[PDB]
Each structure stands twice: as C-alpha cells, then as structure tokens.
C-alpha cells in the first residue's frame, strides 16, 4: 500500500552538485509513476530498456534515484554511450542502461541575481569513470611532469570549479535538475513494483 | 547572512610589520577562496593576496609577493594578512573579500569578482623620506 | 557520424498508398527508437509516428491513427512508414528520427538526437 518516495527525490530542497551526485535507494515499495504521467514541464523524460508507457506494470529486483545539478548543455551527456567533461569525469551511465533519465530548466531555483556558484563539476581527473563511479575526492591535478604535493600552480591545478548560474545565461549555460531512476534486474526477488 | 569584520590597521613605519585579521561569520568558502583588496585615496583597487580554503594554496600581487603572507584558521574561520617589510605605497584601505565561486586555477582571483567583503581596515606607513613635497 | 537516409517519396493520387524507407548507416540501428516527422508547406515539424526498439510499442500522430504503419526491420537497419488512403493535407517533407531512449513526450523534436534530411510526398488530385 506504501509508494515509493519519488516526492523526496524530485522535490527534495536542494540538490547535489554532479561531482558529488546523490543516490537514493527505493524498495520495498509500490513505484506509481502516475505523477511523473502528469507532468508536461520536463525538458527530457526518456527511459532506455524498457518503454516510459511500462513502467506502472514492471517489477525490479532494485531501484536506484540518481540526481543533481548540470548546464542545458550537458544533459544530452546524462544517457548510455555519451563522452564529455559529464560523462567522462562527473556522472558516467552505462553503454546498457536501464531505467529513466529526468530532467527539467531549474532557473527559478538554481540562478540568482550576480550568480550562484553553489554547483560544481570536476574539471580534470586522470581517467575516465566507470558507470555509477563517483569522486569526490579534491587533490590537486597534476597536468605535468612534475608533482603537485598539494601546492597549486603552474601544471597543479584544484580540479572543480563552479557552474555560474546567471539568469541572463543562454539556454545551454542554464540550469538542469537531473534524476536518474536506475532498474536491476537480478536473480532476486522484486523489490519495486508498479501498481498494476 | 554573512559579514567579513577586518581588524588589526595601523599606524607602522616602513620596514615594519602588520597582521590583518578578516573574521568570517555566516558561513564557509570550502572549495572557493577569500582574498584581501586595498584602495589608496583617488587611487583604484588593486588584488593583493587570494588563498583557496580547503587547500591553503596562496596567490600574491607581485607588488606583496615575498613580504605579504596570506593565510586562514579553519576553525576560527578566519584568513590573515601577514604584512612584512612595509612600504610607504601599501598605504591603502585593506579589505577582506570572499568568493562563492570555485575556480579551477587560483590565478582567476586576482580578477573574479567577489561576492563579500568587509567594512574595511585602514593601514598608514611613516617613512623618513618626506615624500608630501610642497 | 550516424546518418538517417529517407526514400520512397514522390507523387501519388489522393485515396493512393506510398511505402516511405529510412536506412541508418552502421550497425546501431537496434538501439534506436525511431520515428517519423513531418512538415507540411509552412507548418512546423508535426509527429507522425514512433516505433520502440522491439517492434512494441507503437505510436501515432491523431490525424494518420488507422491509415499509416510505421514497422522497422533490424536486419537491414530500415524502418518503413505505410501510407494508405493518402489526402492532399499529407503533402509534405517526411522527416526520419531516431534516438537510443524512448521518450515519455515521444512526439517532441528536441527528444531525438539523429535526423535525415526528408523525403517529399505530394498528393494530387
Ligand atoms: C512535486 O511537487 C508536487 C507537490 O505537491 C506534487 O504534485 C508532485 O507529486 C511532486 N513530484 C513528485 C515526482 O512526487
């Protein structure tokens, strides 16, 4: 009789920044996607391995909601297959995908007037994420021959810097609240099911 | 509902040495950085030392650099300007500034914009050059 | 570097039928959602039809429902659209779209990363 509690995830008052993305799990629970049905405001509602149409009537051995804050430009980045500074060093999805990717223009919330910079992404790092990876680790980068030790400079650079979130930024420089809803399918039983 | 109060302007010969004090309450700048300014009458602003919080890396003016030393107490929340070898010329009004944005190369707050700042804190160097020459 | 190639556009006679064909080069086209667009002479990009990746589901703008069969062949990396019982006001560029995700919205544009350039149909009488 208990939904699960996609409210918390998608209304949740802030947001993590794509660097440090926050995963909820949901289980043991009836997952009604019939407020998600009702909702006309999302920039992208797209479901890989199984059809948006399906999801009332499936069960999933787990479910796992993924979300933060990237730029409009970057959310062709949130899906299997895609190479980027997103996909490459912040949030990586798998070539296989399964579940949903949510997202929708968060301007009223996440700009200000001279700027919010509360939002981070990683800049460099030494190697790609593997799918679901997540660093949220800030040594110094080393980008020449020569070792940083934790001292910034030429070649040592800190590897986040801020997303600026200016309301007279253009569409692709905006801000996007994203959530990823991930399925397993294991042999285990069915944690979330639709209600039908 | 952040304020930066600076504290410890003076009066100091040349030669002589200051320690700023910038106190901030309100909040953090975890991965960004804070940064002293100063402004000398009919003169304009000049960037004289930036530090990034979590780190401690320094960035200087290099008018200050090797006499001026910033530096900042996590858990007094507090960055300092060490000021040694005064000049007549580092006669300004000093103020702390903090940045809400993390910049990947620390060299980028010498520039960027900041978002806070402090009332002020006047500093004075004496010389014996008699340099007001009427 | 994906590319939609359309054909099988050209003039038919108003009550006619017409066998539209898109070909994606390589060898991702199973990954694909595809659909079709249209646009009529000064009219936006307007759905036509969307096929998932396993055949089902179907979809299908208001006014083709009943007379278009959108169908794909993995094989030979072509979805098809059937038009039968074809009207003047389906005189248009036939646009072929694909995508690796099934939209929610699948009748919005901005949902589908791959595009052909279209194929014209005009119906006479
Ligand atoms: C978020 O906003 C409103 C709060 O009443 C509600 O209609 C909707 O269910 C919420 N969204 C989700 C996904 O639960």
């Not at chain 1, 790092?125 to 800030?138: G, V």
């Amino acid at each position: 009789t208990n939904l699960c509690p996609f409210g918390e995830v998608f209304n949740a008052t802030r947001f993590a920044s794509v660097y440090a993305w926050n995963r909820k799990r949901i289980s043991n629970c009836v997952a009604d996607y019939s407020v998600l049905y009702n909702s006309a405001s999302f920039s992208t509602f797209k479901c890989y391995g199984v059809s948006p149409t399906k999801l009332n009537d499936l069960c999933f051995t787990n479910v796992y909601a993924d979300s933060f804050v990237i730029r409009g430009d970057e959310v062709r980045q949130i899906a299997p297959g895609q190479t980027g500074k997103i996909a490459d060093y912040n949030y990586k999805l798998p070539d296989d995908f399964t579940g949903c990717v949510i997202a929708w223009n968060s301007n009223n919330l996440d700009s200000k007037v001279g700027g919010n910079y509360n939002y981070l992404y990683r800049l460099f790092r030494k190697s790609n994420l593997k799918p679901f990876e997540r660093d949220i680790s800030t040594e110094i980068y080393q980008a020449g021959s020569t070792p940083c030790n934790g001292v910034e400079g030429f070649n040592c650079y800190f590897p986040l810097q801020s997303y600026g979130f200016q309301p007279t930024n253009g569409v692709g420089y905006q801000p996007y609240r994203v959530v990823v809803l991930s399925f397993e399918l294991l042999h285990a039983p069915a944690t979330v099911c639709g209600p039908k | 509902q952040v304020q930066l109060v600076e504290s410890g302007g003076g009066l100091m010969q040349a030669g002589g040495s200051l320690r700023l004090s910038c106190a901030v309450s309100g909040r953090t700048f975890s991965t960004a950085a804070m940064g002293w300014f100063r402004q000398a009458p009919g003169k304009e602003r000049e960037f004289v030392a930036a530090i990034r919080w979590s780190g401690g890396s320094a960035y200087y003016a290099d008018s200050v650099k090797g006499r001026f030393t910033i530096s900042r107490d996590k858990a007094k929340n507090t960055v300092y300007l060490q000021m040694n070898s005064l000049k007549y010329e580092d006669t300004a009004v000093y103020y702390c500034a903090g940045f809400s944005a993390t910049r990947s190369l620390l060299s980028d707050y010498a520039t960027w914009p900041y978002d806070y700042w402090g009332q002020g804190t006047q500093v004075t160097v004496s010389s014996k050059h008699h340099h007001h020459h009427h | 570097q994906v590319q939609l190639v359309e054909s099988g556009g050209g003039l038919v006679q108003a009550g006619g039928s017409l066998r539209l064909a898109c070909i994606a080069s390589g060898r991702t086209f199973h990954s694909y959602v595809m659909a079709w667009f249209r646009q009529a002479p000064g009219k936006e990009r307007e759905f036509v039809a969307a096929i998932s990746w396993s055949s089902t589901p179907t979809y299908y703008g208001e006014s083709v429902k009943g007379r278009f069969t959108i169908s794909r062949d993995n094989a030979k990396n072509t979805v098809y659209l059937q038009m039968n019982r074809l009207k003047p006001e389906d005189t248009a560029v036939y646009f072929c779209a694909a995508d690796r995700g099934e939209s929610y919205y699948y009748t919005r544009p901005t949902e589908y990363e791959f595009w052909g350039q279209g194929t014209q149909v005009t119906v006479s009488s």
